[PDB]
């Protein structure tokens, strides 16, 4: 995240850090005891999931927090890496997450009314500048949902299953934030997917959660 | 291409337009009678290559030019779409291309000395503005090779098998240019791979051809 600030400890208990062989790869969110939500882009190309771990309960990359193992990853069958569509995936855990004050699930948006031009929150460990290193401390930032009609004109091949944000140059998502949660009114409305490599004044694009609620419920771990 | 100009007819005989079901998808270049060079990103996600056609001998998308059928596509086994590495692929043609004044192959760079800070040429049918429609006429633009040492600091995870370009905001590659040829001194030195969605003052990144000459020769059609 570019232009954000260090998040208070425990303020975002639903935040997940997906780490590959110990290194942060993408953000994700806790849906329930056995399921974590992320972007397909983050797990589609992985050959060995035994090296992918789910880290929760911590604001720092230097800390392990509570670590959970991945049983499998379910990628939306319609995910298109070229057109950047249906960028959504579920990570199933081998053992259930133990909730506490620092680890809690987040509700999914099932109603996107009145979201446009209103505030929303983004969190993540992505770079704080293009070509920059990942910050150790979780970052937070308040953005604005960019009207769909405008985003369709501003970005490349944006469709109804996308949602966008935009404030100004100097504020936005960056490498490492992908898969992370965009929230508003206590519900996750988007999954960080793509944009124009870090806060250059162009909208950031997210997978619209409400468009995949059905798919998510159908693929939740048994 | 943003900030370019209409290319003269026949000036770039090695330019290819890869079209999927009749619509431009990516650029590419002619290596010889049976092989076309492009980015792995352009063909990795395709399942039915019978829908993909190679178009040469024309500067316009509204024209068909000479059309060739695809027998197979060979993607570098080390292609990583998350880290954006080894973005290179070969498209094998079922029948040989007939060369003429409008259709000719291009030489591959096997020596990248003195390229940095010097001019190079990029051609393609990519958008002329982020979120814009593809131009009908092939566009051309003269760029400058951005020093590797600087590009490594400016972009995300740039490595030795990448080459970069950069001039200023308002000039650069855009959606639809991927897979296209970056040339200098009559040799292709790069394959359009990624960047920060259209000429925003950040370097555009290409697959460095010289780094894959061996791989290319080893996978050329028999």
Curated annotation (Swiss-Prot), chains A, B:
GO terms for biological process: proteolysis. GO terms for molecular function: serine-type endopeptidase activity. Coiled coil: none annotated. Its EC number is 3.4.21.1. The keyword Hydrolase applies. Disulfide bonds join 26-42, 151-164, 174-198. It holds the Pfam family Trypsin. Keywords: Disulfide bond, Hydrolase, Protease, Secreted, Serine protease. The active site is at 41 (charge relay system), 87 (charge relay system), 178 (charge relay system). It catalyses: Preferential cleavage: Tyr-|-Xaa, Trp-|-Xaa, Phe-|-Xaa, Leu-|-Xaa. It is found in: Secreted, Extracellular space. InterPro entries: Peptidase_S1_PA (IPR009003), Peptidase_S1_PA_chymotrypsin (IPR043504), Peptidase_S1A (IPR001314), Trypsin_dom (IPR001254), TRYPSIN_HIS (IPR018114), TRYPSIN_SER (IPR033116). Belongs to the peptidase S1 family. This is Chymotrypsin-1. It comes from Solenopsis invicta (Red imported fire ant).
């Amino acid at each position: 995240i570019v232009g954000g600030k260090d998040a208070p400890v425990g303020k975002y208990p639903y935040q997940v850090s997906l780490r590959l062989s110990g290194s942060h790869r993408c953000g994700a969110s806790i849906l329930d005891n056995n399921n974590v939500l992320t972007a397909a882009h983050c797990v589609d190309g992985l050959s060995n999931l035994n090296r992918l771990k789910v880290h929760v309960g911590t604001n720092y990359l230097s800390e392990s927090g509570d670590v959970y193992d991945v049983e499998d990853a379910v990628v939306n069958k319609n995910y298109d890496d070229f057109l950047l569509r249906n960028d959504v995936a579920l990570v199933h855990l081998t053992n259930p997450i133990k909730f506490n004050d620092l680890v809690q699930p987040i509700k999914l948006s099932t109603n996107d009314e009145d979201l446009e031009s209103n505030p929303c929150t983004l969190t993540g460990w992505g770079s704080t500048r293009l070509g920059g290193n990942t910050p150790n401390a979780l970052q937070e930032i308040e953005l604005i949902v960019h009207p769909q009609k405008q985003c369709e004109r501003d970005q490349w091949r944006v469709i109804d299953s996308h949602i966008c944000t935009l404030t100004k140059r100097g504020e936005g998502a960056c490498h490492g934030d992908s898969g992370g949660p965009l929230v508003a009114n206590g519900a996750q409305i988007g999954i960080v997917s793509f944009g124009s490599p870090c806060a250059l004044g162009e909208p950031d694009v997210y997978t619209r959660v409400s468009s995949f609620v059905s798919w998510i419920n159908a693929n939740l771990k048994k």
